[PDB]
Structures are given as C-alpha cells and as structure tokens.
C-alpha cells in the first residue's frame, strides 16, 4: 500500500505539581506530528503554534463558550480526573524482584560480568548500585536503562564488569519508593 | 512536575482508523474499543475503581475525522512521512529452563500508527496466548506499541518478532533464543 496517509492527533494534557495544588492544562492539536494550535491554561486563550493553526486560534477565541470550557478544565477535567484515578496510579507501588547472576562478555570465556536484574517495579524512578566488599564500585557499570514493560511495570538490568575472585562478596543495592529501606542481594564467587 | 495525565486521540486517513486512550506518566490507563463501543482498562482492577462512558470517545473521534479533512486541505494535501520503528525483543523476567515467562516485542518511534506484527517460533507464526496493546503516544508525537507472547523456555525453540511498517523496505525481524 503506497496511498498517502494523513493523520490528525489531539492530546488533552493535565500537568500536576504537588498533587492538585498546582495544575496546568494544555490542549494540543496536531497534523501528522506538527502541533498547530493549543490552549495553555497559563495563557487562557488559544494560540496558533504554526501558520496552519491560525484560523482555529482566531475562531475558537471568538467563541466565549469554548474559551470558558477551556478555562474551567483545570478544575472540571484535570483536578476531577486526578481525584478519580489517583488511588491506583499516583499511589501505585510495586516492589522489584532482584536477582544477581554471573554472565560472559563472550560466550567462550569464563564469567567476567555480574548482572543485577531488577524486575517488575512501579513507579520507574529507581537507584541501583554495585558494591564489592562493602565499597561501592562505580567503574565498569553498564545498564539497559529503565525499561517499560507496557503493563504498568518496569525492569532494568545493571551489569558490573568484573572478574570475580574467591573471597569477594558482591552486593547489588536497590532503592525505590516501594521500599522502606534499601534492598540488597549478595553474590559470592 | 509530579504527574501527567493525557487523553490522546488520533484519526488516520484513508484507513479510517481512530483511537482514544488515557495515558498516566507513559502508561495506558484505558482505551476505547471503537467497534465494540466499550471501555477497555489496561489492568483489570482499574475498572473496579473507575468508569468511563465509551460513547463520548466516539463523539470526539468524529470531530477528529472532520478536523483531519479540514487540515488535510489547509496543508494542500501534504501526506505524512513514514518513520520506521525501532524494534526490541526482551523477556518479562530472567529466563530459566521450563519456567513460564513472557516475550515482549517493543515497537517504538514510528508513524503512521499502522503495523503488522507476527510472533514466529522456529520460523512459524504463533498466535496462542498472544496479546498486544493499542498504539501508545510518545512525547515526540510518534507512536509505540507492545506485543506479548507467554512461552516455556527451552533450548529447542527460537523466536522472532516480525514487524512490517510502510517505512520499512522489508519486514524487520528481531530474534530471541536461550543462553
């Protein structure tokens, strides 16, 4: 199929700061990826983002009823919906399952990589650190980064490049809002 | 900034596809099945706490379709440029032999919101147990999407997520196997 496509998008955004104490509503219209007109509650009228949106900004701004619907939205839409969903979204906490296991930089070698797998957590903000004999190791650390699973959980793998020696105790430490103290997992060669 | 909630909509011509969903911090709260006119909660439990009248989505999508007509003309019929996806295959959790796990095919940074996605096991399409999300909005106004395949990990099977998109010259296959 080589027929040309044309796409319209709309994003009605509610931005929350300190719960519902400070709230900003941003109503956005797009042609393909180009935002062409928006209402920003900071402004209280529509503004054209590109020339394409000038006719809509000018007309919608002439319609007092449309403007007042837009102006109330921070309250009747944003603050309202925050109220409706906050208990299972804002307050959602899922603690991670932490596993540590050795790996190889090349399938033929011995083990020269330690993996700290952190799975299934929510929300996304997390701090994962490696320790060797109680001292934090900051060199040779690499990660997948934060990975969304698409099902309201995240995961991340944090690797330590090291050749383990007998006697050494490695510790992966995880800090996350679902945790009241750091979660630590030990691994020994 | 603590949190963002977005009611995201699109309408695509000539496909006549429209979508309506709510996003919280990058995760889908729910979408509306336009054909069935039903609210589909991303997690089962969400719907015990909240409701949404699906009919309102249909009304919005109708406006979006009319607006697309208008904007298409304003643009002098300038079509969208295809942006092919990045595709990653990973598992839900660390893989162990014969321990139930889930393959995730993550399809990211693409537009228009149209793809054909197939799971292949040993080079053969598989459909039992599969599931997928709708098209999820990105802050750069492209799209992302997830497909899922529960599986029992063995050394016998290899897997591929095959993704077709108009921005690709040929289907993109991303491989996964044990070890």
């Amino acid at each position: 199929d080589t027929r040309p496509r044309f796409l319209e998008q709309v994003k009605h955004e509610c931005h929350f700061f300190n719960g519902t104490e400070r709230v900003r509503f941003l109503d956005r219209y797009f042609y393909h990826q180009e935002e062409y007109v928006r209402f920003d509650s900071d402004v209280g009228e529509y503004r054209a983002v590109t020339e394409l949106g000038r006719p809509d900004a000018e007309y919608w701004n002439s319609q007092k009823d449309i403007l007042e619907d837009e102006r109330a939205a921070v309250d009747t839409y944003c603050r309202h919906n925050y109220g409706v969903v906050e208990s299972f979204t804002v307050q959602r906490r899922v603690y991670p399952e932490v596993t540590v296991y050795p790996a190889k930089t090349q399938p033929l070698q011995h083990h020269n990589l330690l993996v700290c797998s952190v799975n299934g957590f929510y929300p996304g903000s997390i701090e994962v650190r490696w320790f060797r004999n109680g001292q934090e190791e900051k060199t040779g650390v690499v990660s997948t980064g934060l990975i969304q699973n698409g099902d309201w959980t995240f995961q991340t793998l944090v690797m330590l490049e090291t050749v383990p020696r007998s006697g050494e105790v490695y510790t992966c430490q995880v800090e996350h809002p679902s945790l009241t103290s750091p979660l630590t997992v030990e691994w020994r060669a | 900034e603590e949190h963002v909630i977005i009611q995201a909509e699109f309408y695509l011509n000539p496909d006549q596809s429209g979508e309506f969903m709510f996003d919280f911090d990058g995760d889908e709260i729910f979408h509306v099945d336009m054909a069935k006119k039903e609210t589909v909660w991303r997690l089962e439990e969400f719907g015990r706490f909240a409701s949404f009248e699906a009919q309102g989505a249909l009304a919005n999508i109708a406006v979006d379709k009319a607006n697309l007509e208008i904007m298409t003309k304003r643009s002098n019929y300038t079509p969208i440029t295809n942006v092919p996806p990045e595709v990653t295959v990973l598992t839900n959790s660390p893989v162990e032999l014969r321990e139930p796990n889930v393959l995730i095919c993550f399809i990211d940074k693409f537009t228009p919101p149209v793809v054909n996605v197939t799971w292949l096991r040993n080079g053969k399409p598989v459909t039992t147990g599969v599931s997928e999300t709708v098209f999820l909005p990105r802050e750069d106004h492209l799209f992302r999407k997830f497909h899922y395949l529960p599986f029992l990990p063995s050394t016998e099977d290899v897997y591929d997520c095959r993704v077709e998109h108009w921005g690709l010259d040929e289907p993109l296959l991303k491989h996964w196997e044990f070890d």
Binding site: P55, W60, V84, V85 | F52, N60, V63, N67
Partner: peptide, 13 residues
C-alpha cells in the same frame, strides 16, 4: 466514579 472526557472542538471549514 467517572472519568470525564475533554471535548475535541470542530475547526473552521
């Protein structure tokens, strides 16, 4: 309780 939708507005023909 019910999630409220934000209406999308018809542009100028």
């Amino acid at each position: 309780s019910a999630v409220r939708l934000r209406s999308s507005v018809p542009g100028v023909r």
